[PDB]
From a paper:
We demonstrate that XMPP catalyzes the irreversible entry reaction of adenylate-derived nucleotides into purine nucleotide catabolism in vivo, whereas the guanylates enter catabolism via an unidentified GMP phosphatase and guanosine deaminase which are important to maintain purine nucleotide homeostasis. We extended the substrate survey for this enzyme to other mononucleotides and found that it is highly specific for XMP. The loop probably stabilizes the orientation of the cap domain. XMPP is a member of the Haloacid Dehalogenase (HAD) protein superfamily with unique characteristics since HAD enzymes typically have either a protruding loop or a cap structure, but not both, like XMPP.
To elucidate the molecular basis for this specificity, we determined the crystal structure of XMPP with and without XMP bound. Unlike the ribose moiety, xanthine embedded on the concave side of the cap domain interacts extensively with the enzyme via (i) hydrophobic interactions with Val28 and Ile32 and (ii) by base stacking with Phe55, and (iii) via direct or water-mediated indirect hydrogen bonds of O2 with Thr61, O6 indirectly with Arg51, and N3 and N7 indirectly with Tyr77 and Lys29, respectively. The interaction of Asn188 with the phosphate and of various residues with the xanthine moiety are required for full activity. Further kinetic analysis revealed that mutations of xanthine-interacting residues do not affect the kcat but the KM values for XMP. For variants altered in hydrophobic residues, the KM increases 2.2- to 26.9-fold. For those changed in hydrogen bond-forming residues, the KM increase ranges from 3.6- to 9.9-fold. The XMP specificity is thus collectively mediated by the hydrophobic residues Val28, Ile31, and Phe55 that shape the xanthine-binding pocket in the cap domain and by direct and indirect hydrogen bonds to Thr61, Lys29, and Arg51.
Residue numbers in the entry: 3 to 238
Write the structure that this text describes.
C-alpha cells in the first residue's frame, strides 16, 4: 500500500475535456501569430508550429531556440489572450470532487498564469488548488532581465527540468504523489521521476500510465486509493 498525499494536475485538456474546442483555437492562434511575425503563408505557419511543438514542446520555446527574441507576454497575449474562454463549461461535479479530496492539489501547466487563472474561474475551481506551477514558474529569467534568446532556453513539460521545478516548488514526495496529464510524453516524464501517473482523455493506458480515464472526474472510482485514510506506507 502506497498512500497518496498530493495530486498534481495539468490544465489544458485535463481539467476540461478536449471537445471544449480550446486546442484547435490555440493551434489557429499560433499559426496566426507566425503569419503576423514572419509573413508566412498559413500552410507554412502550421508546418512550422508542428515542427517546433514536436521538437521543443512549444512554438514559443522553438522560436527562441532559433534565435528569435519573442517575449513570452507577447506570445501568450496573442495565443491565449484570443481564446474562446466562454466555451469552457463549469464543472460542478469536478469542483465537488476536488472539495471532497483531502490531498494537496497542485496545478502544473505549460500555460501562463493569466490563462490558467481564467480557465480555473470558468470551471469554478478558482479556490481548489494550493499551488500553481506555470510557464513563469519554470522560466523566471525570461522576465525583466534582458537576455539573448539562447541564454535561458525555455523550460516546459515534458522536460525533466520542468518536472524537477514542479517537485521542488510544490515540495512533494514523488512516492506519495499522483500526476494527471493528457499528454503521453508528459506522463512518460512524470513516470521517469518516480510519480504515479494518470493519463487523462483516453480509456487505454500507455506504458508509463498507471491509470487512464477519459474524463478527470472518473478518478473518484478509478483510483480508490485517493479515499484511503491510512497515513503511512505498509505491506501485507
Ligand atoms: O506549440 C504549440 N503547438 C500546439 O499545437 C499547442 N497546443 C497547446 N499548446 C500549448 O500547450 C500548453 C498546454 O498546457 P497544459 O500543460 O496545461 O496542458 C500551453 O502552453 C499551450 O500554449 C501548444 N503549443
Ligand atoms: Mg494538455
Amino acid at each position: 500500500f502506497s498512500p497518496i498525499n498530493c495530486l498534481i494536475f495539468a490544465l489544458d485538456d485535463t481539467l476540461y475535456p478536449l471537445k471544449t474546442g480550446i486546442a484547435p483555437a490555440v493551434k489557429k492562434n499560433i499559426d496566426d501569430f507566425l503569419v503576423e511575425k514572419f509573413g508566412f503563408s498559413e500552410s507554412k505557419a502550421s508546418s512550422l508550429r508542428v515542427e517546433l511543438f514536436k521538437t521543443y514542446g512549444s512554438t514559443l520555446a522553438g522560436l527562441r531556440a532559433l534565435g528569435h527574441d519573442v517575449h513570452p507576454d507577447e506570445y501568450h497575449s496573442f495565443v491565449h489572450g484570443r481564446l474562446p474562454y466562454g466555451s469552457i463549461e463549469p464543472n460542478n461535479k469536478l469542483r465537488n470532487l476536488l472539495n471532497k479530496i483531502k490531498q494537496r492539489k497542485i496545478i502544473f501547466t505549460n500555460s501562463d498564469k493569466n490563462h490558467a487563472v481564467k480557465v480555473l474561474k470558468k470551471l469554478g475551481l478558482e479556490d481548489c488548488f494550493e499551488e500553481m506551477i506555470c510557464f513563469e514558474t519554470m522560466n523566471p529569467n525570461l522576465f525583466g532581465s534582458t537576455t539573448r534568446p539562447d541564454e535561458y532556453p525555455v523550460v516546459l513539460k515534458p522536460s525533466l527540468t520542468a518536472m524537477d521545478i514542479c517537485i521542488r516548488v510544490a515540495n512533494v514526495d514523488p512516492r506519495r504523489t499522483v500526476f494527471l496529464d493528457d499528454n503521453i510524453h508528459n506522463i512518460t516524464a512524470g513516470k521517469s521521476v518516480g510519480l504515479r501517473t494518470i493519463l487523462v482523455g483516453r480509456a487505454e493506458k500507455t506504458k508509463d500510465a498507471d491509470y487512464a480515464v477519459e474524463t478527470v472526474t472518473e478518478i473518484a472510482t478509478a483510483v480508490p486509493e485517493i479515499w484511503a485514510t491510512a497515513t503511512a506506507t505498509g505491506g501485507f
